[PDB]
Amino acid sequence: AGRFTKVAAAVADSVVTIESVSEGMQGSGVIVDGRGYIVTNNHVISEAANNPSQFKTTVVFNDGKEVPANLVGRDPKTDLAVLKVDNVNLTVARLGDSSKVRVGDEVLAVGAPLGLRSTVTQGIVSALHRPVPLDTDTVIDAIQTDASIAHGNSGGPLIDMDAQVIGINTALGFAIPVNEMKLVANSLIKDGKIVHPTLGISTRSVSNASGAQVANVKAGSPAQKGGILENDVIVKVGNRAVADSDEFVVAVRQLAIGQDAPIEVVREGRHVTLTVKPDPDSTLEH
Amino acid sequence: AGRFTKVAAAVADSVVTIESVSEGMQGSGVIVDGRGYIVTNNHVISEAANNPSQFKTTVVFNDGKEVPANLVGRDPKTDLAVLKVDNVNLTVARLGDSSKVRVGDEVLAVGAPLGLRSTVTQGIVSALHRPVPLDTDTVIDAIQTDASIAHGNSGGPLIDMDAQVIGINTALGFAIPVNEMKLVANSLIKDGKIVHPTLGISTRSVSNASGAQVANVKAGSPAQKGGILENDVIVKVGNRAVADSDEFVVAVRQLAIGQDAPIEVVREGRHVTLTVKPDPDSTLEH
Amino acid sequence: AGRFTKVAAAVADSVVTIESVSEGMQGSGVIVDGRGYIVTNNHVISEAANNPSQFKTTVVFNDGKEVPANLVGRDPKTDLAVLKVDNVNLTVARLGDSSKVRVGDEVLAVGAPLGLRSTVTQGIVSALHRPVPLDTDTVIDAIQTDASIAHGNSGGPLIDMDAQVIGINTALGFAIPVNEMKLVANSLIKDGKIVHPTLGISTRSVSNASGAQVANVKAGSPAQKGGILENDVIVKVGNRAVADSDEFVVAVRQLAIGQDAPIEVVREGRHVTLTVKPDPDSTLEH
């Protein structure tokens, strides 16, 4: 048994096929809780959550066993989604620590074994916390990897050499970190819904100071009250520095809701600093 | 000497350049028999076997030595082909076992060293027995690998870590399993020709039960006598289950010729079961 | 710490971000001399050397420290370029030996860590001395690798397993060998300019003898005096054999300037042999 052959064998029973039929779409997912909670990506079941009348998500295990599915919740802003299999034994995956992942580590982008176009690709960690563009469109602070990510392993986990989940694949290959995955899944399980910060700002990238040049501020938004104007260039949102519009959408998510936060920007070349109170995007869930 | 550096060095003298000139086309191949039998893929020499008057296939070894070639036989249905070098010493490759290959094993997609666009790529086994579409067109029950397969290593072997051939490259990278390779090469050497099963059925894929929806049945075919109609959906051919039209063409090849075999299909949603006697595709060679 | 994780960690401080602003363009480079000499590729700073009035190349280290840059020299014919950081401590990279590199060795295509689209890809050596086509356009006798080369690691080094530079990345992935890199950088530092051989010949590829069919000979060139005509097919330039026009441009560079050299060619199918005295491309620097 080789190095990568043993890792894919242990975690295989913890990887699952996810398919919604009507047509049809198929994907992958990982078993993260013994109660029957399976984590996938939102675009896999995105067609099962916008059309619930003509679709029926099913769960195919590694041993061929089928079972119905139950959508616990999803998060299109970080492209995560949690499913439920009631009264199923269950091979629980081992969840890793994304903060301990370093550039250079060997990883495995596992897909569901019984899948039609399943993959199992191997690479290393090419980048950490890379904002990548990807139901509302979004951008994620992802783990980059030279292991190929396609329809096969999309949904499946990004496994380290200790057979532990360092991320969840999404579709030069990118994965959502496991630490951002656990936080979203822990509040998608409990609260059935996540609440992300918001400032009400449409931005565009620039490369001249660079950053996210503001396009349109929402009327009544926290940004409109903190003094952010159009045409200024956001160079730092809070403790994070903003390199372009892709990193701008990711920086606002790490801001505490209600806590007044600083936002540095350059308007007419002149560097101003701006205080904003991040609103919740879900006024009914917060 | 590294791990992959030693494997490619031992098997290098067993990998060969194959080139037909007139324009011209070049490829790769492996030495599998001491008598001078070299295995390649059919599309490499496909232009040397349909135009034998304006072409002349030649064999370039790792030590630069050239020699003429002799087409023993080919199989476009599994994209295999065997050549012959008379009175040549000869580095015989070690043939592996495809059934022992597991997802995760490190592999090497070797190409002919002296080739113009030669490659030597490294990956793992991404999938086993994946029907892939690819002279009559066909589909093969291939070994998938994340190692790149291109014009360089096309023809060359897919080598495991024990420096043993687990497959032969063909042109997200796919290879023909060595066990299906040996069987085809053993009867392409002896009988000079392979004979594959046939039922006389044109099929199309569907994803609603799914499977291979039948398009046109050949008049007088075994399928026309066993009761298979048009518009029904083939869900299983024999002991194999049919997921789409690509897997359908692969399942019929494993059926014994003359032996009555079952074929389950759904016509008007109603699941019927059908007995068919697979014909040989070569009535003169069987 | 994994195998590839330790190699990328040691050499990380020796890899540098290179950016010219006005927009703007960013790249990568390696620290090869303690005096502050940083090597990159010419197309990275190509916009900083043709437009010096509206651009300002800057150097960002791994520890975030910025510093201005100083163009010591560049070579578009082998796509190399050397920069200068005065009075900077400095993590000097360990330079490897390209002649000791064998097909199969694990390599790391490192990019600048703080880069916007930085990569760190891992592969093996797929080919040695592969002429690849790539300010005057050119072709290089490059190291091929299955590790992905993109805008991220372009400029950065191709690191072996001993944390030593075997090449410099350029943009199925290719790198300029470190031995050809040192020679160009040693005379780009000293003489501020490289001088490459020239014969005055425009060639085109052919695959029938094959080689580089001559298109246009420059009036007064060494080729026009040694007896090379148009329409003949160059099959060998010196000790090198010419397989196509891409290898032809690389073979002339290894010829000594002034030393009469042989050039074998086939005109009307008849094999002639031709003596040429390679001119310097820079009559003022030689």
Side-chain angles (χ1 to χ4, degrees), chain A residues 1-2 4 7-18 21 24 26-29 31-32 34 36-39 41 43-45 48-52 54 59-61 63-64 66 68-69 71-76 78-86 88 90-99 101 103-113 115 119-125 127-129 131-133 135 138 140-143 146-147 149-157 159-165 167 169 171 173-182 185-186 188 192-200 203 206 208-212 214-215 217 219-220 222-223 226-229 232-234 238-245 247 250-251 253-254 256-258 261-262 269 271 273-274 278-282 285, chain B residues 1-2 4 7-18 21 24 26-29 31-32 34 36-39 41 43-45 48-52 54 59-61 63-64 66 68-69 71-76 78-86 88 90-99 101 103-113 115 119-125 127-129 131-133 135 138 140-143 146-147 149-157 159-165 167 169 171 173-182 185-186 188 192-200 203 206 208-212 214-215 217 219-220 222-223 226-229 232-234 238-245 247 250-251 253-254 256-258 261-262 269 271 273-274 278-282 285, chain C residues 1-2 4 7-18 21 24 26-29 31-32 34 36-39 41 43-45 48-52 54 59-61 63-64 66 68-69 71-76 78-86 88 90-99 101 103-113 115 119-125 127-129 131-133 135 138 140-143 146-147 149-157 159-165 167 169 171 173-182 185-186 188 192-200 203 206 208-212 214-215 217 219-220 222-223 226-229 232-234 238-245 247 250-251 253-254 256-258 261-262 269 271 273-274 278-282 285:
Chain A
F4 301 118
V7 179
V11 308
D13 284 314
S14 314
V15 186
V16 165
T17 318
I18 295 169
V21 288
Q26 196 193 70
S28 179
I31 317 170
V32 305
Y37 286 112
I38 296 163
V39 179
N41 27 15
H43 60 285
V44 161
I45 65 166
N50 289 49
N51 203 186
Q54 305 172 9
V59 162
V60 187
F61 292 87
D63 58 5
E66 271 188 342
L71 173 48
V72 168
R74 46 165 174 138
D75 186 359
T78 57
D79 196 11
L80 272 163
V82 181
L83 289 173
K84 186 51 165 67
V85 282
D86 305 81
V88 173
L90 247 215
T91 335
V92 199
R94 292 203 297 262
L95 304 180
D97 193 1
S98 175
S99 58
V101 175
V103 170
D105 304 335
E106 289 104 0
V107 294
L108 275 154
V110 190
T119 69
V120 176
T121 72
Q122 180 259 314
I124 65 169
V125 176
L128 312 158
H129 309 298
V132 68
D135 280 325
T138 188
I140 60 173
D141 195 64
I143 291 162
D146 59 310
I149 304 292
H151 198 126
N153 47 12
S154 184
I159 306 286
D160 59 49
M161 278 330 279
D162 302 331
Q164 301 183 172
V165 187
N169 308 326
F174 310 110
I176 307 164
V178 68
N179 283 18
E180 190 68 10
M181 186 280 287
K182 290 184 279 187
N186 278 345
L188 267 170
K193 170 103 205 184
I194 205 74
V195 182
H196 274 308
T198 184
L199 292 180
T203 60
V206 67
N208 291 322
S210 310
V214 173
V217 182
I228 294 190
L229 307 178
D232 55 13
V233 191
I234 290 174
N239 57 347
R240 231 248 171 81
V242 168
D244 46 21
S245 50
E247 182 155 67
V250 186
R253 272 204 297 253
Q254 316 291 347
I257 286 148
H271 258 163
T273 305
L274 296 152
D279 263 344
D281 57 8
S282 297
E285 280 98 333
Chain B
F4 301 118
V7 179
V11 308
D13 284 314
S14 314
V15 186
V16 165
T17 318
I18 295 169
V21 288
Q26 196 193 70
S28 179
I31 317 170
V32 305
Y37 286 112
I38 296 163
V39 179
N41 27 15
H43 60 285
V44 161
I45 65 166
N50 289 49
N51 203 186
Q54 305 172 9
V59 162
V60 187
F61 292 87
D63 58 5
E66 271 188 342
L71 173 48
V72 168
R74 46 165 174 138
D75 186 359
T78 57
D79 196 11
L80 272 163
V82 181
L83 289 173
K84 186 51 165 67
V85 282
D86 305 81
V88 173
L90 247 215
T91 335
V92 199
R94 292 203 297 262
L95 304 180
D97 193 1
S98 175
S99 58
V101 175
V103 170
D105 304 335
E106 289 104 0
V107 294
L108 275 154
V110 190
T119 69
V120 176
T121 72
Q122 180 259 314
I124 65 169
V125 176
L128 312 158
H129 309 298
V132 68
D135 280 325
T138 188
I140 60 173
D141 195 64
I143 291 162
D146 59 310
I149 304 292
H151 198 126
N153 47 12
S154 184
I159 306 286
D160 59 49
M161 278 330 279
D162 302 331
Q164 301 183 172
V165 187
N169 308 326
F174 310 110
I176 307 164
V178 68
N179 283 18
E180 190 68 10
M181 186 280 287
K182 290 184 279 187
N186 278 345
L188 267 170
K193 170 103 205 184
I194 205 74
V195 182
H196 274 308
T198 184
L199 292 180
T203 60
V206 67
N208 291 322
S210 310
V214 173
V217 182
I228 294 190
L229 307 178
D232 55 13
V233 191
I234 290 174
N239 57 347
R240 231 248 171 81
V242 168
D244 46 21
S245 50
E247 182 155 67
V250 186
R253 272 204 297 253
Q254 316 291 347
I257 286 148
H271 258 163
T273 305
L274 296 152
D279 263 344
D281 57 8
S282 297
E285 280 98 333
Chain C
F4 301 118
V7 179
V11 308
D13 284 314
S14 314
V15 186
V16 165
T17 318
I18 295 169
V21 288
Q26 196 193 70
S28 179
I31 317 170
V32 305
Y37 286 112
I38 296 163
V39 179
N41 27 15
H43 60 285
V44 161
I45 65 166
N50 289 49
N51 203 186
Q54 305 172 9
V59 162
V60 187
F61 292 87
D63 58 5
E66 271 188 342
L71 173 48
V72 168
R74 46 165 174 138
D75 186 359
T78 57
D79 196 11
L80 272 163
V82 181
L83 289 173
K84 186 51 165 67
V85 282
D86 305 81
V88 173
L90 247 215
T91 335
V92 199
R94 292 203 297 262
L95 304 180
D97 193 1
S98 175
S99 58
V101 175
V103 170
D105 304 335
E106 289 104 0
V107 294
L108 275 154
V110 190
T119 69
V120 176
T121 72
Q122 180 259 314
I124 65 169
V125 176
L128 312 158
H129 309 298
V132 68
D135 280 325
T138 188
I140 60 173
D141 195 64
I143 291 162
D146 59 310
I149 304 292
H151 198 126
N153 47 12
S154 184
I159 306 286
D160 59 49
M161 278 330 279
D162 302 331
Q164 301 183 172
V165 187
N169 308 326
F174 310 110
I176 307 164
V178 68
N179 283 18
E180 190 68 10
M181 186 280 287
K182 290 184 279 187
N186 278 345
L188 267 170
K193 170 103 205 184
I194 205 74
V195 182
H196 274 308
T198 184
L199 292 180
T203 60
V206 67
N208 291 322
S210 310
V214 173
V217 182
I228 294 190
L229 307 178
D232 55 13
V233 191
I234 290 174
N239 57 347
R240 231 248 171 81
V242 168
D244 46 21
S245 50
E247 182 155 67
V250 186
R253 272 204 297 253
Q254 316 291 347
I257 286 148
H271 258 163
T273 305
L274 296 152
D279 263 344
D281 57 8
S282 297
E285 280 98 333

